[PDB]
Design a protein around this nucleic acid. Structure first.
Ligand code: FME
Ligand code: MG
Ligand code: MG
Ligand code: MG
Ligand code: MG
Ligand code: MG
Ligand code: MG
Ligand code: MG
Ligand code: MG
Ligand code: MG
Ligand code: MG
Ligand code: MG
Ligand code: MG
Ligand code: MG
Ligand code: MG
Ligand code: MG
Ligand code: MG
Ligand code: MG
Ligand code: MG
Ligand code: MG
Ligand code: MG
Ligand code: MG
Ligand code: MG
Ligand code: MG
Ligand code: MG
Ligand code: MG
Ligand code: MG
Ligand code: MG
Ligand code: MG
Ligand code: MG
Ligand code: MG
Ligand code: MG
Ligand code: MG
Ligand code: MG
Ligand code: MG
Ligand code: MG
Ligand code: MG
Ligand code: MG
Ligand code: MG
Ligand code: MG
Ligand code: MG
Ligand code: MG
Ligand code: MG
Ligand code: MG
Ligand code: MG
Ligand code: MG
Ligand code: MG
Ligand code: MG
Ligand code: MG
Ligand code: MG
Ligand code: MG
Ligand code: MG
Ligand code: MG
Ligand code: MG
Ligand code: MG
Ligand code: MG
Ligand code: MG
Ligand code: MG
Ligand code: MG
Ligand code: MG
Ligand code: MG
Ligand code: MG
Ligand code: MG
Ligand code: MG
Ligand code: MG
Ligand code: MG
Ligand code: MG
Ligand code: MG
Ligand code: MG
Ligand code: MG
Ligand code: MG
Ligand code: MG
Ligand code: MG
Ligand code: MG
Lengths: 114, 118, 56, 123, 209
RNA sequence: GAUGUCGGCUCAUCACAUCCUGGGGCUGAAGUAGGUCCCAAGGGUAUGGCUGUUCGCCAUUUAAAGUGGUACGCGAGCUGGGUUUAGAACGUCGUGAGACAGUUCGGUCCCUAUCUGCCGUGGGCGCUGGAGAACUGAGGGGGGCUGCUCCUAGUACGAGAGGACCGGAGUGGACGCAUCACUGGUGUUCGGGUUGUCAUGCCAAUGGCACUGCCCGGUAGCUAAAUGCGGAAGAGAUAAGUGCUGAAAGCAUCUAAGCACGAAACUUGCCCCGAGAUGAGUUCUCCCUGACUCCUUGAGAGUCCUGAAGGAACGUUGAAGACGACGACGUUGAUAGGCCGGGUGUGUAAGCGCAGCGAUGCGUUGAGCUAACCGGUACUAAUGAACCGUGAGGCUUAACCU
RNA sequence: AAUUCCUUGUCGGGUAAGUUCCGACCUGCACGAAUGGCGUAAUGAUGGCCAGGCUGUCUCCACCCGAGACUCAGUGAAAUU
RNA sequence: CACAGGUGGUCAGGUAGAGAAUACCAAGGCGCUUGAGAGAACUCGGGUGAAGGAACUAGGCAAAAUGGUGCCGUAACUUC
RNA sequence: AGGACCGAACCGACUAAUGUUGAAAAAUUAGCGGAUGACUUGUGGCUGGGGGUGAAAGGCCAAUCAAACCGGGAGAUAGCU
């Protein structure tokens, strides 16, 4: 509906860069621990992107301490302070859900030259 | 519940529905007017009209699309050579439905479906 | 799953009271031919709303 | 969502390797336990000279779940396996002196400041 | 006090500056025109009748058109009544806007919920099904027993069975009001309100409190 | 001339001789925690191991894991493990056929609901002229559970160890209502990958079939594991209990008059239905104010003219729906389909060119296709009509204006 | 124990918890030597128990595809009374 | 019964395949003598499923799962 | 070589669901066992009712079996309904 459309567009971010599944990104997200508010970096492969305007989200998977971690960021959430693409990956899919069974040599995403 | 769902099941499976509507669209193209059950015509609209929209702008890719659907060279040739140029100026609604009583065998509400320039 | 006592013709008629058909309210008259046809249906001879839509 | 008969891995150097939930404490007919919910477990596979032996019945706190927790913004954090850190039945303090793998913000509480302080990373 | 009649535009979220996503429902609470004032002396109870929106000229029937023209207001799409507290007093023709919820923190939203059709017992009353296997026969979702035996030899009133579910008036209470934008005629409540998009909602101030 | 007999599952409903929470008395009640008795049935009242078992034991919880009635509730609702068919064997009994509330393995559980009942849902007529809408509200139903932490407060109490009543927040468990913004599920109507094979003359490209062939994602919708909300506060009359004043009985005494307090029970307060509430209510609004016979002169029958508000019917239909019903729209038109733009989804179409001997890669290209979504657009289909509904609405009395 | 009543004998193993199972003891109600005793590799749509994998069997169901059920037209039963 | 049952022999093509299995097809035969619409509960036959994984139950009943060829490797026990 | 192995035809019938006035007076769907043999099958023949035949269940002997079916004794008898 139009009214909802303006209500979303009033809050949507404008600085969000272009990234694709297979890209390695790092997302610095505000952490409010104690009284002090800082930034924490989460870096990993982007395995899913859901585009719905304000309701857009994306899933980042990393391998921390031998423990795979997935995190679904709401792209326009104020907590998601910033995103930066540390590497362009080239894949023939839109959701890389097969990387869950893969680790190490079998979880390598080829670079995208152009 | 079927809220906001679209498309009629017509007491058939999906493969049979697909093949039946392919055949019905072929017949409607070929004869420019056919007599069907009223819901079958109301569902054949949604299949036939996109074929004409596809035929409006001619290309080898569009020919292969309209042949992947329908699957007849005679039908695709007729589409692109007449029904495209004939409907080039009309923005949809290429078909007209005229309820024509009931069927003798099973009291099925029947309707004619026609091309609007026939 | 079966009756214990036989229902009367009274109760049978009471049940069938809702089975009566309903006559068509009023036929429409085609404007050009004057034929009678069901509303929003083409006439027997192929006319509808003042046009010849189907040959024969 | 850890319920009875759920096999959790062990995220500390306390000796256990696989444990099985046997009870979700904290309420009647309670169904599941999330990150930060105390459960009663039994050790099903332990290392030889570890602190605790196979078969013991003792509590544990869930720290990583495949279902994962939801942040107020709507985000979720999903791990690749369910993990718990053993606690003593009475003291309810961690038994292991190390915690492996990440833990989450859901433990930033007085009861689990040990785990938060000894964790590798807190997400 | 009195409420307003709105339309459920849809449901969105609000990202507060502290990174919290409030799931809000958007209600298009436009102006409500008071078509009638009912008092004790003539009606035995104090209430106002309001209308909202606008209806088709040729589909506003002559009695309804006359009733609106008595008040001198443009024919809205419906008529709703709101009972009055003793202090407040309204007059005919007054256009009440969503600014009425400027200082109201919690509201009650009542509307017709979605119609689930003919809902079985498992859906309607959360009856538990029976073993999908282990020998079960044609009774994987049936209600099971529905009574005792020869005593009482009858099924009690109010028994839970299958039937029509939804499509009935439902009131969700004590919803937090997030934003009251009068310039766009909007009300934003924290949470989900009954009914599907486009339905009519009656939003009153909180009554529990 | 048959009332199916244990246990399990689903579903319950009542009693109070109450398990928890709620209010009290006494205590060999310091405090916490008790013991016991009185009032109280609103709500709640475990998951597993063993066994066919209800039961019991045990593990671990919980505020609690109540006792009973209901054909030891519930097989025209499910099961068939037990016991009671026919097979077989063990121990024992008998010479034997065979037998054993001794065991051990195996063993066809039928019914399309007429009536009552219950859950939904309509049709008819009534409600005293007809119609549209809003509603009052008799009456009925739903809901009523509770913990843990923190403050009060290491305060009262206590030798200390220990550790409050009262009051106030925060946060959960179970349960219920709603919803789909989010996390996801499904998504055989969307996109792609690929195997076998057949076909479209062949290459290329596609289509059929193989459970959607097998998969990979996924739009709308519906959904839960997802997210919001609820249990109340207060008021009235009380129970057990506590009293004030107070005699009968110079005192005494909660009572005999009179006054007060008092619980999750009761009546309300919250939510839903609800004027067939035949006691058929109220308030707005709208519509119809023409003649004429006959008489069985009756609240009579009939003819002509007239059909109103409105309704119904038909059509396009819906986040409404089994069918009815309900809602929207019918060209004074966005009701549905199509079309246009977008979103979304999958993921760089075909054709052509280049590199490679070739599979293949690269360029046009993030292209192509894109269901149910969104914003628009009368292009197609919602036709003039016709049909039902009438023509001022009984009598008596009262009060008014005359 | 296909035998064992009392009895869920007692001890040990397996389980958080094991009336079933395995190994023992012997107090054999009421084993026992061709109406065979004790073992026994292989075999079994054989009985009991345990573990790995796997799963809607279940926590707790949700959605979808078809055939009925539902409406319309034609035909048109039955038990029972 | 124009009944999802029973009935002996003979012929037996193409591709993939060990195959008279199986998948698609030729030659040939057939769409099964009621259909049409809607897309409720519930039943039947199927598909998929978050986290868990026998906690279900009399019992893993049912379903899920394994599944081919070549090579490597293979325990207790044994009548070898 | 083999009463060998895996597995179609062929023979059976272990589990489940359906059905239980069924499509069928014992079947269908999904699995399941044997599948060169104590196999299976066509055709013809033989054995008959206190008798046959039986790798044994009181099984089978024309949808009938602790003694077939048909006719007769026979209108058996019925202290029973
Ligand atoms: C026993 O009393 C009897 C069962 C014996 S039949 C195997 N029950 C009758 O109701
Ligand atoms: Mg639609
Ligand atoms: Mg049909
Ligand atoms: Mg197919
Ligand atoms: Mg009788
Ligand atoms: Mg009828
Ligand atoms: Mg609906
Ligand atoms: Mg259950
Ligand atoms: Mg079943
Ligand atoms: Mg009888
Ligand atoms: Mg009592
Ligand atoms: Mg009561
Ligand atoms: Mg009460
Ligand atoms: Mg028990
Ligand atoms: Mg077990
Ligand atoms: Mg058992
Ligand atoms: Mg009983
Ligand atoms: Mg009972
Ligand atoms: Mg029973
Ligand atoms: Mg039954
Ligand atoms: Mg019964
Ligand atoms: Mg009965
Ligand atoms: Mg049995
Ligand atoms: Mg026997
Ligand atoms: Mg009766
Ligand atoms: Mg959702
Ligand atoms: Mg949406
Ligand atoms: Mg998804
Ligand atoms: Mg979805
Ligand atoms: Mg899919
Ligand atoms: Mg090719
Ligand atoms: Mg074919
Ligand atoms: Mg005195
Ligand atoms: Mg896109
Ligand atoms: Mg392609
Ligand atoms: Mg014993
Ligand atoms: Mg033990
Ligand atoms: Mg023991
Ligand atoms: Mg033993
Ligand atoms: Mg012996
Ligand atoms: Mg002996
Ligand atoms: Mg002897
Ligand atoms: Mg022997
Ligand atoms: Mg054998
Ligand atoms: Mg197991
Ligand atoms: Mg019929
Ligand atoms: Mg036939
Ligand atoms: Mg044969
Ligand atoms: Mg062949
Ligand atoms: Mg074959
Ligand atoms: Mg052929
Ligand atoms: Mg269906
Ligand atoms: Mg099913
Ligand atoms: Mg499946
Ligand atoms: Mg699952
Ligand atoms: Mg998936
Ligand atoms: Mg999974
Ligand atoms: Mg159990
Ligand atoms: Mg069990
Ligand atoms: Mg099985
Ligand atoms: Mg052999
Ligand atoms: Mg045999
Ligand atoms: Mg078979
Ligand atoms: Mg076989
Ligand atoms: Mg064998
Ligand atoms: Mg074999
Ligand atoms: Mg022979
Ligand atoms: Mg003889
Ligand atoms: Mg015998
Ligand atoms: Mg016989
Ligand atoms: Mg004899
Ligand atoms: Mg004689
Ligand atoms: Mg005789
Ligand atoms: Mg006789």
């Amino acid at each position: 509906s139009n009214i909802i459309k303006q209500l979303e567009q009033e809050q949507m971010k404008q600085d969000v860069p272009s990234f694709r599944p297979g890209d390695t990104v790092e997302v610095k997200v505000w952490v409010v621990e104690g009284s002090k508010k800082r930034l924490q970096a989460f870096e990993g492969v982007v395995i899913a992107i859901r585009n719905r305007g304000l309701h857009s989200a994306f899933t980042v998977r990393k391998i921390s301490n031998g423990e795979g971690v997935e995190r679904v960021f709401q792209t326009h959430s104020p907590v998601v302070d910033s995103i930066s693409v540390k590497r362009r990956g080239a894949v023939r899919k839109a959701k890389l859900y097969y990387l869950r069974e893969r680790t190490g040599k079998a979880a390598r995403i080829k670079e995208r030259l152009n | 519940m079927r809220h906001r769902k679209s498309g009629r099941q017509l007491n058939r499976n999906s493969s049979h529905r697909q093949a039946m509507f392919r055949n019905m669209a072929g017949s409607l193209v070929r004869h420019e007017i056919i007599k069907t059950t009223l819901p079958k015509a109301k569902e054949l609209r949604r299949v036939v009209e996109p074929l004409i929209t596809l035929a409006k702008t001619d290309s080898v890719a569009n020919r292969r699309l309209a042949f992947a659907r329908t699957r007849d060279n005679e039908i695709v040739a007729k589409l692109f050579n007449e029904l495209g140029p004939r409907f080039a100026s009309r923005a949809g609604g290429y078909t007209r439905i005229l309820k024509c009583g009931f069927r003798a065998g099973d009291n099925a509400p029947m309707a004619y479906i026609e091309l609007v320039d026939r | 799953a079966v009756q214990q006592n036989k229902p009367t013709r009274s109760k049978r008629g009471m049940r069938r009271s809702h089975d009566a058909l309903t006559a068509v309210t009023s036929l429409s008259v085609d404007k050009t031919s004057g034929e009678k046809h069901l509303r929003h249906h083409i006439t027997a001879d192929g006319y509808y709303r003042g046009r010849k839509v189907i040959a024969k | 969502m850890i319920q009875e008969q759920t096999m959790l891995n062990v995220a500390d150097n306390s000796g256990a390797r696989r444990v099985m939930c046997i009870k979700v404490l904290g309420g009647s007919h309670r169904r599941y336990a999330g990150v930060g919910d105390i459960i009663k477990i039994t050790i099903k596979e332990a290392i030889p000279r570890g602190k605790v032996k196979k078969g013991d019945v003792l509590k544990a706190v869930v720290v990583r779940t495949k279902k994962g927790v939801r942040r107020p913004d709507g985000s979720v954090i999903r791990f690749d396996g369910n993990a718990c850190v053993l606690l003593n039945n009475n003291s309810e303090q961690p038994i292991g002196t190390r915690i492996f793998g990440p833990v989450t913000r859901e433990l930033r509480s007085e009861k689990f400041m040990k785990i938060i302080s000894l964790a590798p990373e807190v997400l | 006090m009195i409420g307003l009649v709105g339309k459920k535009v849809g449901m969105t979220r609000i990202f507060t500056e502290d990174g919290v996503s409030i799931p809000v429902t958007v209600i298009e609470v436009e102006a409500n025109r008071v078509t009638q004032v009912k008092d004790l002396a003539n009606d035995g109870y104090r209430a106002i009748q309001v209308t909202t929106g606008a209806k088709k000229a040729n589909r506003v029937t002559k009695p309804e058109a006359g009733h609106f023209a008595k008040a001198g207001v443009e024919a809205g799409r419906g008529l709703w009544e709101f009972r009055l507290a003793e202090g407040e007093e309204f007059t005919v023709g007054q256009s009440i806007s969503v600014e009425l919820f400027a200082d109201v923190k919690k509201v009650d939203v009542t509307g017709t919920s979605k119609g689930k059709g003919f809902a079985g017992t498992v859906k309607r009353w959360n009856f538990r099904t029976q073993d999908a296997t282990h020998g079960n026969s044609l009774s994987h979702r049936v209600p099971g027993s529905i009574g005792q035996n020869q005593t009482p030899g009858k099924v009690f009133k109010g028994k839970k069975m299958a039937g029509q579910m939804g499509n009935e008036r439902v009131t969700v209470q004590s919803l937090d009001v997030v934003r009251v934008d009068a310039e766009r005629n909007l009300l934003l409540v924290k949470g989900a309100v009954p009914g599907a998009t486009g339905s009519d909602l009656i939003v009153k101030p909180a009554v529990k409190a």
